[PDB]
From TrEMBL, chain A:
Species assigned in the record: Chaetomium thermophilum (strain DSM 1495 / CBS 144.50 / IMI 039719) (Thermochaetoides thermophila)
Protein's name in the database: Mediator of RNA polymerase II transcription subunit 14
Role this protein plays: Component of the Mediator complex, a coactivator involved in the regulated transcription of nearly all RNA polymerase II-dependent genes. Mediator functions as a bridge to convey information from gene-specific regulatory proteins to the basal RNA polymerase II transcription machinery. Mediator is recruited to promoters by direct interactions with regulatory proteins and serves as a scaffold for the assembly of a functional preinitiation complex with RNA polymerase II and the general transcription factors.
Subcellular location: Nucleus
Subunit-level organization: Component of the Mediator complex.
Annotated transmembrane regions: none
Domain of life: Eukaryota
Signal sequence, start to end: none
UniProtKB/TrEMBL annotation, chain B:
Species whose genome carries this gene: Chaetomium thermophilum (strain DSM 1495 / CBS 144.50 / IMI 039719) (Thermochaetoides thermophila)
The protein, known as: Mediator complex subunit 15 KIX domain-containing protein
Highest taxon above the source species: Eukaryota
Entire protein: shown range: 88 to 320 of 1625
Automatic annotation (TrEMBL), chain C:
Keyword Nucleus: yes
Organism of derivation: Chaetomium thermophilum (strain DSM 1495 / CBS 144.50 / IMI 039719) (Thermochaetoides thermophila)
Gene giving rise to this polypeptide: MED16
GO biological processes: positive regulation of DNA-templated transcription
Protein name: Mediator of RNA polymerase II transcription subunit 16
Keywords per UniProt: Activator, Nucleus, Transcription, Transcription regulation
Chief localisation class: nucleus
Entry's localization field: Nucleus
Family membership noted in the UniProt record: Belongs to the Mediator complex subunit 16 family.
Gene Ontology CC terms: mediator complex
The keyword Nucleus is annotated on this UniProt entry: yes
Domain Mediator complex subunit Med16 N-terminal: 134-424
Portion of the full sequence shown: 71 to 969 of 1130
TrEMBL record, chain D:
Gene name linked to the record: MED5
Subcellular location: Nucleus
A biological process term (GO) from this entry: regulation of transcription by RNA polymerase II
Protein name: Mediator of RNA polymerase II transcription subunit 5
Gene Ontology annotations for the cellular component aspect, listed alphabetically: mediator complex
Residues shown, of full length: 60 to 893 of 1099
Annotated function: Component of the Mediator complex, a coactivator involved in the regulated transcription of nearly all RNA polymerase II-dependent genes. Mediator functions as a bridge to convey information from gene-specific regulatory proteins to the basal RNA polymerase II transcription machinery. Mediator is recruited to promoters by direct interactions with regulatory proteins and serves as a scaffold for the assembly of a functional preinitiation complex with RNA polymerase II and the general transcription factors.
Highest classification ranks of the organism: Eukaryota, Fungi, Dikarya, Ascomycota, Pezizomycotina
Gene Ontology MF terms in the entry: transcription coregulator activity
Family stated for the protein in its record: Belongs to the Mediator complex subunit 5 family.
């Protein structure tokens, strides 16, 4: 029952992304694929075996190789999400690497949670129940283009003026475009680092 | 043998993970025949909800990191698991707050459907419910943080096969 | 010429086309009346569009019954009038003032008259007289009709003349008289003899029914001598009718009447007066070489030129001229004929004084006129069309020589075309015409169809006819024609249909600059209060009509004049509102929503500009206009200068602050303790929407509007200070330097001290949030945005005007 | 379900039905001849069926003439009904009688025997006796104008000798009713034959049913020409003494006057005996040799001028003629001037010895020697100055009466025609003093002091020229002042018997107000009703193209084609009286 028609429809529905890729298109043929995108990594899809599967290279997105399966197999084959969400995850990784020297000693710690596929949250914790802070990161309206609006959650009791006093040397509630968010992330990490090493 | 236990202990923890990621949702899809199945929707809801607690108890069985935090105190290793390192990620005090939280969606739904002695486009007090999302997405994650807090302590003793 | 040879001179059948109030109606071959108007072409808007009969025409129904009656216009196209075997023959309009139109139709039948009524220019007429009790005989009242004129609130009527073309042209008024009236703001139609009678129906009483006519026999008949053609007008204080009864005799009856005794008014129109001489010279014999193709017959009714003379001393004599003769051949003998005879009536005394008439002289071109004859300016007759499609050999009233045939500017130019460069364009042979209210265009009916209106056009792209410098005073000409008989309620204009956008200057700063120097707009409202800011002609913002596109990007700095009519209409509606409660409160709430949306948008655009790269430096501040027109960002020239938007919104805030208290005043009466009181259902909605303002509260947008308005005075009264009974007005400076911004320009080289972003702004700053009012819905995207075509997905998404909500059209 | 379908123009439609049904008996401006040619030459293209009717009508309409685009769409027969010559004669004898010789003889839709015209006049008498219009004897040509048969006998005898006119009509004179036109009001059968069909040897032994000639012209040994002119209204036969009487108005113009004053005085009266001359002779044989004597030419000289002028103003005003006689500067250019020209330009009492005796209280008029051509340019101005001088107080009533007693048969009476033709525009005007002055001057004119029976008959012959435009103004003033007239009926009940004139072929009040009628959607021997004063009176009110459309719409649907065509054809090709002018 539609034995070859299954692969026929699969390829006929997946070839749509070949027009919108605009990256290095594909070095692979049917029963597999590859849409490799680097500067100067590739993702090994699957089509046979379950139903489908994805496979990656060891850096920068393995934090979501369990949220991508549903988006790939169920919704559509329109994975234009990586090409516009890469810098954010690069910043995530560089921050989680730069906070290394603190976790050795008893200085502090930083966690990242990814409440959904787009709504992300980051949390700083300090040793003696001094503080427990959590900032939400979320995209917003697309008048010209998408904009990330990072800050304290909306209806969380702000607990005014305990350390937001210090955190207001950066306005504490930013808004950034999809090309220069790393500067804001680093400027927000350095302040908390200087406040924790004291 | 400690190698053979820490291996597949990391597996038990990776496997109990993604349960939170699948439970973040509740998928309340409503949109006589139509009646008598809202209770079955709530049935499947409480179904997917429960059986997380027994797994929590099974994890608290072989929770063996309260005994390693002591050695971790002074200059503990404390290496967080960055999935950029293990590309596999694949095969080879209370949480009744969740039920207490779900319990506030039958009553504030009855109070929304008790508007037939009322207008048509004013029963939309569902400009509320922006508190339950916050409360759940906080309760589940404030204890999801424990998995990341303990998976680090897991390999404090298994640095290089505990022997080299 | 088998149709121009099919023209009737047996009656005064009257034109079938007509126009007033921007409508045009025609009688299509004798069974239906078709309507059409002049639209803006909602797609890529070009004014050139005459609708192709997409409206509800009116049809003569031929069926009948032993007892049936004419129907009225229900929800569908049913507007039927019962016929009796005769087609429509005559259509005429009636003057009106902004409230309700009128239009009557006389049938070539025994002389039955119907009257339609339009209420909101929605081309959907109702009935006012049914003509179901009228005789069937030889009345045939087509031989002439006349609506009485309606008065003016002064002694005379004024029309202007722009002269003195130099640094600026000053303009002086000309004026003529208006003799009769009606003793109301309604009107009255008098249709002349049914070949015998008088028969004028209009006695609109205290009730609203057009009462029965009045009749009075004049020049009874007992043989075959019928009044073939008659015409009437209104000379000093009284009417004046004249007939030509089938022979070479023409008679003049002066029908004096002003009994309307004052309740139920009845009006005996007695006092008809014979005595005006019956000069038998309708055509005199010049017998010499008889057997040649001379001696044509009268074709156009003798139109009475009223006594509009008013020569400087006092009034003068009338002139009842016999319109042309127009032989048409059936040697070669070309058409080549229309002598126009002229006869005036003086009063001389050799003994007991009788009146007398004297033929002046004759003149005859080599074409066939008679399609239409219309008098312009009330002084200079003309526009005699010659049917060769060549509209107009317009000839003066005195001495009848050709006029307006020589271009010149350095002195009095009283008409837009033919003097500054404009010219006509010929379409093709025609049969009937009808001129615009401004006499700047006409619509003709050729052999087959009603060809679109034939308009003037400027010879643009000529090497030495460019519009720059002193040659840009081709605008005072196009202005001095926009004021005609009964035009002081400015907002009704059609001559926008002259678009020269290869120059881009007449867009504004000329055609809006001159009406200021014309009627003294006096738009410096930055001194006292926000109370009397409702002018009838300052509201005439035509810069919106030059929007350059529709559903596409709107011309920036051409919607500064679009944001104002909204915050004018929708924000005086509140003060216009114990009315019908459970249905207007929701509309009030829906308007308050849009108001709060506009406040949010303005307080957003103030940010992201409060921290730009603006540098004063005392040598910059000339960049101000270019740097704003580059970003196409009109959020400062509307909130700072122009001296009256800072008052319109300053009053809108005071109205919203009154609106937000009714909810808190009424909910105490409502909830003070069982099913859908149905008015609290809307009071609840109003209170719910009067708290979703972010932190605006409408109490601080007034302090931040009063602070700057008081700060401006410190400079306005310290910069215009220049060193008994010395006038020393010097308010014209405040007028001029505060009037040139409405047409987008720069500030006044001193309003860059009154720019204290530190003081008067960092205090409204902590009554909002950084990232709370920067991410909203802002459905005002209909005016100000160019990135997306998503709004044209299906049947589009339009915004209402009365309720101000969303709308889909599919 | 009574519902009107046509009104005010349904008379043609309700008339043609009656005529088509009677067809089975024994129960300048232009007109249609030039307005159907237009509809043909411009064929109504995109034509379902309406082109057949139009092209066939243009084909059939060429009976008047002869003195392949649409292929005619058919070959439909033609019938010679009884309603062709009926309409032709009824239209020719409705105004100025215009039945001439060749324009009537060269009317051949028949080709062999003209019996269809010996009862088409009996039918006209029968149709105009009932529906009372007996105002006619001008339609009694049954006796006198039957020279048609005596002229048609030899014109056919030149080649065919088998006509036998004696037995031609006696099978026609058996086909008329014996109740109206009896055999022994109407007594016409006993007098048609045996009184006209023996003067010409066309009936002998006519039991079962002085031939004076054209050479009665020695008017020199006698002057019986005032007995011939009296025996015109007598109809035994031989009213052929009219061509033999119009050869005296030529002899006495090639020679001198003064033997013509009595003839003109006796023809000026009795206006009902002026149509009989035009029945027989052309119009250009009287005017042209009578208008060319005034333009080229003592007490009795004034009389000879006035008595001859009294005839032109009767001919011109009874038939409403124009200046179509001298077109080819003359005294006959006076019909243009009926307006007081001016004063002080070049008049200055040029010839005003008159008004020093004509209205003075001094004496007679003997030495005033001015040419008699002062009728023009000095009647209206003189009377206007008299009215002005009487308005203010300058001429007392005694002088006024002693003056007005100078204008009776003194060769000044025929001068009053232009005088009180212009004086009728000053009574239509509006000012009380002048109106009352005219009323006071009109009293010794209408009702006289009963003097000089000759002058009385001259006045009674003048009055019927101006009686039409003079009572209109009187009625107008009566309407203007309908409270105290007390003078006006005294004059209206006097200038009333002489309101018999204007034979111009036009409708009137009690017929115009009587044939505007309706049409809903739900017979003793006499003929069907018809009157040609209806067609050329609807053609003036309604457009000619509109009436052509009506006729075509009616003919397209009317049953019995071949009979419904003859009526319309002979109704369109009939002689129009209004739009036809005479010539040489």
């Amino acid at each position: 029952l539609g034995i070859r028609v299954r692969q026929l429809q699969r390829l006929l529905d997946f070839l749509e992304g070949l027009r919108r890729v605009g990256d290095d298109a594909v070095p692979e043929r049917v029963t597999l694929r590859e849409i490799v995108f680097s500067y100067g990594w590739r993702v090994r899809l699957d089509l046979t075996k379950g139903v489908v599967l994805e496979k990656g290279n060891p850096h920068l997105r393995v934090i979501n190789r369990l949220e991508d399966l549903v988006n790939s197999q169920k919704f559509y084959s329109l994975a234009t999400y990586l090409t516009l969400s890469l810098p954010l995850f690069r910043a995530f990784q560089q921050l989680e690497n730069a906070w290394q020297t603190a976790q050795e000693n008893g200085r502090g710690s930083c966690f990242i949670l990814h409440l959904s596929l787009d709504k992300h949250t980051i949390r700083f914790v300090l040793p003696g129940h001094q503080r427990q802070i959590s900032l939400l990161i979320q995209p917003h309206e697309k008048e010209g283009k998408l904009v990330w609006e990072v800050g304290r959650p909306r209806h969380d009791p702000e607990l005014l003026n305990e350390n937001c006093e210090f955190n207001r040397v950066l306005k504490e509630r930013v808004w950034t475009i999809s090309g220069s968010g790393f500067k804001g992330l680093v400027t927000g990490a350095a302040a908390e680092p200087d406040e924790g090493i004291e | 043998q400690r190698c053979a236990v820490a291996a597949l202990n990391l597996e038990k923890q990776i496997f109990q993970n993604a349960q939170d990621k699948a439970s973040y949702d509740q998928a309340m899809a409503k949109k006589n025949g139509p009646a008598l199945q809202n209770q079955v929707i709530t049935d499947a809801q409480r179904q997917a909800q429960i059986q997380q607690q027994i797994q929590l108890a099974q994890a608290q069985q072989r929770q063996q990191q309260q005994l390693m935090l002591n050695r971790m105190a002074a200059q503990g290793l404390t290496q967080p698991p960055q999935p950029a390192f293990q590309p596999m990620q694949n095969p080879g005090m209370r949480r009744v707050n969740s039920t207490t939280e779900n319990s506030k969606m039958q009553i504030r739904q009855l109070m929304q459907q008790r508007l037939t002695p009322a207008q048509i486009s004013e029963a939309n007090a569902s400009g509320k419910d922006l508190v339950y999302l916050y409360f759940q997405n906080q309760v589940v994650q404030v204890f999801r943080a424990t998995m990341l807090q303990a998976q680090e302590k897991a390999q404090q003793v298994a640095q290089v096969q505990q022997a080299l | 010429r088998r149709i121009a040879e099919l023209r009737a001179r047996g009656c005064c059948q009257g034109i079938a086309w007509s126009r007033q109030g921007t409508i045009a109606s025609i009688s299509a071959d004798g069974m239906s009346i078709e309507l059409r108007f002049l639209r803006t072409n909602p797609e890529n808007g070009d004014w050139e569009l005459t609708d192709a009969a997409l409206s509800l025409s009116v049809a003569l129904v031929p069926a009948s019954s032993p007892s049936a009656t004419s129907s009225s216009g229900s929800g569908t196209s049913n507007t039927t009038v019962i016929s009796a075997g005769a087609p429509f023959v005559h259509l005429a309009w009636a003057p009106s003032v902004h409230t309700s139109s009128f239009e009557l139709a006389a049938i070539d039948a025994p002389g039955r008259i119907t009257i339609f009524l339009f209420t909101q220019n929605i081309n959907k007429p109702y009935l006012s007289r049914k003509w179901d009790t009228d005789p069937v005989d030889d009345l045939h009242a087509v031989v002439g009709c006349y609506w009485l004129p309606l008065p003016f609130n002064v002694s005379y009527v004024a029309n202007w003349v722009q002269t003195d073309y130099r640094y600026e042209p000053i303009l002086s008024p000309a004026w003529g008289p208006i003799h009769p009236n009606h003793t109301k703001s309604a009107l009255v139609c008098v249709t002349t003899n049914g070949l015998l009678k008088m028969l004028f129906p209009q006695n609109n009483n205290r009730i609203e029914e057009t009462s029965i006519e009045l009749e009075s026999v004049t020049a009874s008949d007992d043989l075959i001598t019928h009044a073939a053609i008659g015409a009437d007008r209104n000379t000093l204080l009284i009417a004046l009718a004249m007939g030509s009864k089938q022979l070479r005799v023409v008679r003049v009856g002066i029908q004096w009447w002003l009994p309307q005794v004052d309740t139920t008014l009845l009006d005996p129109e007695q006092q008809q007066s014979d005595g005006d001489a019956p000069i038998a010279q309708l055509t005199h014999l010049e017998i010499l070489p008889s057997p040649l193709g001379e001696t044509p017959q009268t074709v156009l009714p003798p139109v009475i030129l009223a006594v509009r003379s008013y020569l400087p001393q006092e009034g003068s004599l009338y002139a009842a001229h016999q319109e042309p003769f127009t032989v048409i051949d059936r040697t070669d003998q070309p058409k080549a004929f229309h002598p126009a005879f002229e006869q005036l009536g003086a009063k001389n005394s050799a003994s007991s004084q009788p009146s007398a008439m004297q033929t002046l002289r004759k003149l005859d071109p080599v074409v066939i006129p008679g399609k239409v004859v219309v008098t312009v300016n009330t002084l200079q007759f003309g526009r005699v069309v010659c049917f060769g499609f060549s509209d107009g050999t317009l000839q003066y009233r005195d001495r009848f020589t050709m006029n307006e045939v020589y271009t010149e500017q350095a002195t009095t130019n009283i008409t837009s075309p033919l003097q500054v460069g404009f010219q006509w364009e010929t379409e093709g042979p025609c049969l009937q015409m009808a001129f615009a209210p401004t006499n700047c265009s006409f619509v003709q009916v050729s052999e087959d169809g009603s060809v679109k209106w034939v308009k003037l056009r400027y010879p643009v792209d000529d090497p030495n006819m460019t519009l720059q410098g002193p040659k840009l005073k081709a605008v005072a000409a196009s202005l001095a024609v926009a004021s005609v008989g009964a035009n002081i309620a400015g907002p009704n204009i059609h001559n926008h249909c002259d678009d020269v956008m290869a120059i881009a200057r007449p867009l504004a700063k000329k055609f809006k600059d001159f009406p200021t120097a014309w009627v003294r707009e006096f738009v410096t409202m930055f001194k006292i209060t926000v109370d009397y800011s409702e002018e009838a002609h300052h509201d005439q913002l035509m810069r919106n009509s030059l929007l350059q596109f529709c559903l596409s990007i709107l011309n920036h700095f051409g919607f500064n004049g679009d944001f104002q009519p909204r915050t004018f209409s929708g924000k005086f509606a509140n003060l216009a509102l114990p009315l019908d409660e459970p249905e207007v409160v929701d509309a009030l709430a829906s308007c308050a929503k849009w108001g709060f949306d506009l406040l949010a948008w303005l307080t957003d655009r103030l940010l992201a500009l409060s921290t730009d790269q603006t540098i004063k430096a005392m040598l910059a501040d000339q960049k101000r206009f270019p740097d704003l027109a580059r970003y196409l960002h009109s959020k400062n020239d509307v909130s700072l200068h122009l001296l009256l938007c800072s008052s319109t919104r300053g009053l809108l805030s005071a109205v919203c602050r009154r609106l937000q208290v009714v909810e808190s005043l009424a909910h105490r009466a409502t909830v003070y303790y069982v099913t859908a009181s149905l008015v609290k259902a809307s009071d609840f909605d109003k209170l719910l929407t009067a708290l979703s303002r972010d932190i605006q509260t409408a109490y601080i947008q007034t302090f931040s509007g009063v602070a700057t308005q008081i700060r401006q005075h410190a400079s306005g009264s310290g910069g215009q200070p220049l060193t008994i009974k010395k006038a020393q007005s010097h308010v014209e400076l405040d007028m001029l330097l505060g009037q040139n911004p409405p047409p987008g320009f720069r500030e006044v080289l001193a309003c860059f001290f009154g720019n204290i972003f530190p003081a008067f702004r960092a205090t409204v700053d902590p009554r909002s949030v950084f990232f709370a009012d920067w991410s909203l819905l802002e459905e005002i995207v209909a005016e100000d945005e160019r990135t997306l075509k998503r709004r044209r997905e299906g049947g589009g998404r339009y915004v209402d005007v009365f309720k101000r909500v969303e709308l889909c059209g599919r | 379900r009574p519902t009107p379908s046509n009104r005010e123009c349904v008379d043609q439609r309700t008339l043609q039905y009656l005529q088509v049904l009677q067809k089975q008996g024994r129960i300048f401006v232009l007109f249609y001849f030039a307005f159907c040619e237009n509809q043909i030459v411009n064929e109504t293209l995109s034509q379902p069926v309406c082109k057949d009717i139009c092209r066939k009508l243009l084909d059939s309409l060429d009976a008047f003439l002869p003195t392949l685009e649409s292929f005619q769409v058919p070959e439909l027969p033609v019938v010679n009904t009884r309603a062709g010559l009926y309409i032709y004669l009824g239209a020719a004898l409705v105004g100025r009688p215009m039945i001439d010789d060749e324009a009537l003889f060269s009317y051949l839709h028949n080709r062999y025997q003209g019996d269809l015209q010996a009862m088409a006049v009996h039918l006209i008498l029968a149709s105009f006796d009932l529906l009372a219009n007996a105002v006619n004897e001008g339609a009694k040509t049954g006796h006198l104008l039957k020279s048609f048969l005596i002229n048609k006998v030899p014109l056919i005898l030149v080649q065919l000798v088998a006509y036998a006119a004696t037995t031609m009509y006696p099978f026609n004179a058996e086909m008329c009713i014996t109740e109206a036109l009896n055999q022994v009001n109407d007594s016409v059968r006993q007098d048609f034959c045996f009184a006209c069909q023996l003067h010409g040897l066309l009936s002998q032994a006519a039991i079962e049913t002085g031939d004076i000639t054209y050479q009665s012209l020695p008017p020199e040994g006698r002057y019986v020409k005032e007995q011939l002119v009296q025996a015109c209204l007598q109809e035994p036969d031989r009213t052929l003494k009219l061509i033999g009487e119009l050869d005296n108005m030529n002899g006495n113009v090639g020679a001198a006057a003064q033997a013509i004053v009595e003839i003109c005085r006796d023809l000026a009266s009795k206006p009902l005996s002026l149509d009989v001359l035009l029945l027989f002779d052309k119009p250009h044989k009287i005017l042209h040799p009578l208008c060319e004597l005034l333009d080229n030419w003592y007490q009795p000289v004034y009389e000879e001028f006035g008595s001859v002028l009294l005839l032109l103003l009767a001919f011109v005003y009874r038939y409403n003629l124009s200046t179509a006689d001298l077109g080819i500067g003359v005294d006959r250019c006076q019909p243009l001037e009926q307006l007081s020209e001016q004063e002080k330009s070049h008049l200055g009492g040029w010839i005003h010895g008159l008004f020093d005796t004509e209205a003075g209280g001094l004496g007679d008029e003997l030495m005033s020697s001015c040419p008699p051509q002062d009728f023009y340019l000095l009647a209206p101005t003189l009377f206007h100055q008299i009215v002005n001088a009487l308005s203010a107080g300058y001429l007392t009533d005694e002088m006024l009466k002693g003056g007005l007693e100078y204008l009776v048969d003194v060769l000044l009476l025929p001068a009053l025609v232009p005088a009180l033709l212009y004086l009728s525009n000053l009574l239509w005007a509006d000012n009380q003093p002048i109106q009352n002055a005219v009323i006071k001057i009109l009293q010794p004119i209408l009702k006289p002091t009963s003097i000089s029976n000759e002058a009385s008959t001259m006045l009674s012959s003048v009055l019927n020229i101006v009686a039409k435009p003079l009572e209109h103004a009187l009625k107008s003033y009566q309407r203007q002042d309908p409270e105290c007239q007390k003078i006006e009926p005294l004059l209206l009940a006097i200038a009333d018997n002489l309101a018999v004139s204007r034979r111009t072929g036009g409708a009137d009040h009690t017929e115009l107000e009587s044939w505007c009628s309706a049409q809903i959607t739900n017979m003793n021997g006499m003929p069907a009703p018809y009157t040609h004063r209806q067609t050329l009176a609807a053609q003036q009110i309604l457009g000619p193209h509109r009436l052509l459309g009506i006729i075509l719409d009616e003919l397209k649907s009317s049953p019995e084609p071949g009979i419904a065509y003859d009526v319309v054809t002979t109704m369109i090709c009939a002689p129009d009286v209004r739009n036809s002018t005479i010539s040489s």
